[model samples]
Target: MSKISVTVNGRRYPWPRVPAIAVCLDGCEPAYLDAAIDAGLMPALKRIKERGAVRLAHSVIPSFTNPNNLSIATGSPPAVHGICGNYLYEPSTGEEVMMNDPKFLRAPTIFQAFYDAGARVAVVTAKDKLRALLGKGLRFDEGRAVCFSSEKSDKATRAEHGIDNASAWLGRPVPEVYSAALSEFVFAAGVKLLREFRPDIMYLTTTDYVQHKYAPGVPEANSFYEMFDRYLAELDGLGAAIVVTADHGMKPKHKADGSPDVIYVQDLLDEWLGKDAARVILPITDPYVVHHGALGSFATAYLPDGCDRSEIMARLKAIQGVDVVLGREEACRRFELPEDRIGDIVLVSSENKTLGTSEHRHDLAALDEPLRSHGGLTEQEVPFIVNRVLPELPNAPRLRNFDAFFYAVTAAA
Candidate 1:
């Protein structure tokens, strides 16, 4: 076709037909894309990019996975969506709820938009947070919008191993087992759903678990790229157009103790301000951190009840690694956070160092997980790649946010 054509969320592109979408969640680095191209593992992608595809920059929130993914589905930043990080402090319930839970997402999603338009839609992922994408409490066709993960059950691991052994028996790298059984299962489940229901639009979200366990450019990361390449290759000729993107990027740092440094910010607040002080500390996986707390998202604080807020903030500013402080109201104003959702203070950390939090509570002996995290504006920039069966419609603008993916896919169809 001379003109680009695809479908998304019940919206037609240059022509009218549904398109398939594949999102690589937690894809924080560029190595995977480079590796995929070098290995020549994805003929479909090669064909698409050769036909005038453009690689766009994907903007993401500073920390954790939930907010970034939510942004993609909701078409708004964390400040607007209210999912500050991997965890959310719900002012309504006074609870520090894990963002993965479906109940935490208070907004409608692009998937719902598709369903509402009378189009068939399905979303499959390797993490339970996919449930969070659909909002808490709404139901879909049984097994239609499902989250499958290696941690979901031991049986999944066994099935993955079986697939691995079979691939090894045939002298293949066994992308299924190498990347985690859940990765393979998701693809299998997606294929089944597409074959049976032939949904006009579908989302395939993969948990780049390897990125977390290993550094961004490590051999393991490359292996994941290879696995994804093979997985996509398997479905290449299925006639479904696809677009791939990541939720956020990852950064690496070593602790003073030679292990990956991780801190429990909650403990820091308790020790410095006294436990009685109502405090909320958010954990960040990048060197930079951003979150919503008692006062709301992107906030900072001054310790000791009687201290002058301005003087305390001034002293905090003097600290070498401290970057900026946005008081409850100021933070809400700057980030467009909910007025009632933040703490009295908000602290923004400088590069390479994070605001010290409570670490006395969580065990400190474990090694490996990155001491740093994403969620700060500095770490919020993520990598994105788009592949399609034909050229996109001319004069269309490139999408920089996850929400635009909905329109892009819909328009492509």
Candidate 2:
């Protein structure tokens, strides 16, 4: 059996049973949870917190979905998993591709390790894109390992997902991809799996559609939290040692004029360094464009041949809303990112703004409402909660959401 010690409340304690379940509330900001608690919206979470420990934790740098999710699953940083963002540039192909494939992952997931140790593992995600990456290096034939996503619930089968028909199993049609129903579907599925399958470990990850569109305490957002609260009760009632956290937080990235307050880094670079001198890639680029118009606060710029790195960094740092610009080596070292997957220069924006490459490349019309995005320090704060109280670790390091696995495994064991 896997054994280790976790230091909490400034004391080291022997870790025991593996946690029964870990829930990742995608884009659930610490502020959102605080508001919900203050507003008495999340009763289930409030009750859980009274008995457990809740802290404001930090997500990994760039604060995007893929890297943070992989980090949580592997119990490590992006440097170890090699997933720096939702999209990455393939040096050999000279093209950018979605970082959803299992082949790109360099480390084994906690689920895989548990399954190898003769434990049943189950993972449910809101987006199908994360299924392959999170389910990497696992066998599903023996019914001991089941990994599926709510977005593709209709496609699940016994051989692949350990279920014949996910919709039929849930007794509901697959929910719309971008709707709040999608997250609800994931929770419902997890509840069912926990009650029936009783897997040794389970991970339920939700979508951020509601979070991206609505701010904390808003009616739409509150309703989502209320629904999530009821489900938390359901999971708790199943006698599982639960850990709840988020991938990243969300923030308003628009100005008072209702226009996206964005710094088009590539546009400025082209003017200063000539056309096509640098290729700026938004690490936030994902399939969900309507949520944030594919604009976020973090980006990477790959300088073309003969461009002076020092000159580029100097100009980028001077731009308004630009938070920090670091060279690839420095960025990787400082942020715990993979050097090979990063660009020549990394750019991050301040709280109220986002970064993009060009206006022409983005769908400005998609910003029918105010733009709220993540992927920076402003959006890295998330809620870290467990449904059990432990000795206080006053001097413990700042909690990271990625370290949930450590707590889950040890606390549950």
Candidate 3:
């Protein structure tokens, strides 16, 4: 391929001279990576960080999987790409729905753009929830594009996923969605695709089950990091310019007693406004809520007509765990979120707390341990790493998780 650049979603990424793979480690808190390195569990990652560039990067606010992954895929924020959350309320239809569908995505991803430019591209995700959205505009009928998820490898087809019988081809069974094996499956699939076809650009993203269940230095977390290091060493040995970043960082949203420290925003609103006077939506709601139980550090609410917005905002800010309360316009501007998708009021909780709709609305019975979650400013700092050095990015004041590919393709040496 010629040394040229292709622009998608207003960001220009240079064509790679060698294979480049961008990995999004879902819910990888910076503390986890550092502790793993210090404990000697991630020698490969430690080596990469020493020789290459390792820096802190921010994820989009309300930093859930759907929005941050889309942000990374498009190299843009929610305001540009329009996927603000995993679940949202559609005012037009008066229906609350999941944002996993491709139609919710407003921007073309780097994968689709690279594939359109005649470059072979592959995308492997831990869950099938994002497979369609990430591969939005790619045409499998023409070839040169492969997209699938480890969660649904059995359903993979050449005509749709650009590969068929992925589990059989990889000689590994599809692992459980809530286990670390799911993320391992993604990395293993990525290695096979890279070794066999050597795609020009490849993307692998995982789930946050382990991060939500355990803290940075626990045995489970350390084991997961060690396993990741092995796969990363293999991918690095394969001669791909590897870039690793996270969709978001995780936090301990629990009290000293190890119980979840939650602020039921909906219950508060109901007391202040009236029963059914306002509706609070937890954007963390998804099919895979077993780990988080839909409790996160972010919440959005739609106010009833003729109610006092300013009074409600002021009252919300007075709550013990509440961090920030913003009206729609300000929240959209501050967070770079789509104006249409935002609620009338936006709220976020503090570092050691989580925001829930109502006590009864969320089922805590599924949580076997104290809650650890994300989706607020406290969890925005994710680690950005590359296997090679990168030149200073032009016009970039700070880094973002989405900048991994931008640096990998355009600047990595």
Candidate 4:
């Protein structure tokens, strides 16, 4: 196939895009990157860094993943896209759904732009988040794009396909060189595609699954760095320029000990006011920690048919765990939440305090449970590392938001 050309392995190969991009989704974290460097893991990336590279001051929403990933892809904030949390409150149906589905995104993505520009694209990770990233009407089988991760694969196929897809695109690296089978799969996919299809741009995202479950300084995180190093070395041989960054960083929390868990007030409302009560909210487990800080806690509710607003507000306020209960008008005014986008009653709780709920026995537990989370604005700060193919270009200036990356990629083409 006639393709766009760029220098690889010291030889110019025809390809679609001039400068290719390979981003590390949710790969940002100081310790993890440091580990990779210390272990001498990714030599290819090491060389790229040695030549010229810059780390941008990027950030993601504090406790959510979808918003951060979308922000990175679209270069827009949650306010604009409306994906304020990992689990959004659907006013139309009074439901909470996962953000990893494509229906949640309200803006154009980088992948759409690349495809629009006639460049072939591929995304391989551990779950369906990439599918959410791709949205509807895009065909994967037609060489448009591909998203692969072990989470989407079954036991037997998971091990084989994940590695096969990644390796098939890019050449395979040594097993010990890989941090996990998933990381190896990503690199392998890149190698396979580069050799056969040779498109204008190829994107690869590795699942930093360990960092999310284990602390950053742990052995699992270290292993990821080691494997990534090997992947980078292999890329260097292909003469492809690479970029590394993360979706968000993790807070210091250990599962062995436990992480902070937030409680949902919905169940408390039901118990105190009876099941017939039409009230819901996520009481802040630690109001002192969340209030006045960039991090956010949930406070949402839906009104029942013919329910009296005054009666509802009065009763909710009287509840023991309730600290600040806002009616629809007050909620919109205080939180700046869109009028049509919020619930009828919004409840706020104090720090370390949570309302009890039978259905959500683990609701309070999640606060002190997850080792890593990124849905809130406090967790929005993400890292951006770039490797320059041209030294004198002066490594793109630092940017604080995700929109800049989209602008850069669009302009680069």
The lDDT for every candidate, in the order shown, is: 0.51, 0.82, 0.87, 0.50
Off by over 4 Å in 2: 1-19, 91-93, 287-292, 360-362, 392-397
Lowest-lDDT window of 10 residues in candidate 2? Answer: 7-16
Q: How well does candidate 4 score on lDDT at residue 299?
A: 60
lDDT of 4 by residue, 92-116 (tens): 5656555556676666665556555
Best by TM-score: 3
Q: Each candidate's TM vs. the true structure?
A: 0.72, 0.93, 0.96, 0.64
Extract clashing residue pairs from model 2: 9-392, 9-393, 10-393, 16-413, 17-412, 17-413, 18-412, 18-413
Tens digits of per-residue lDDT for model 3 on 222-289?
Answer: 99999999999999989899888898999988889888888888789889888767888788767346
Q: Which residue pairs of candidate 3 clash? A: none
Q: Model 1, stretches more than 4 Å misplaced? A: 1-16, 39-47, 90-95, 98-101, 132-179, 255-257, 261-278, 283-309, 329-336, 348-351, 354-356, 369-372, 389-399
Best-first order by lDDT: 3, 2, 1, 4
Best by lDDT: 3
Off by over 4 Å in 4: 1-19, 91-93, 98-101, 135-137, 140-144, 150-179, 254-360, 363-372, 389-413
lDDT of 1: 0.51
- Model 1 residue 184 CA deviation (Å) reads 3.6
Model 1 agreement with the true structure over 341-393: per-residue lDDT tens digits: 45666666554454445444433433345454444555445554555533442
Error of 2 at 238 (Å): 1.7
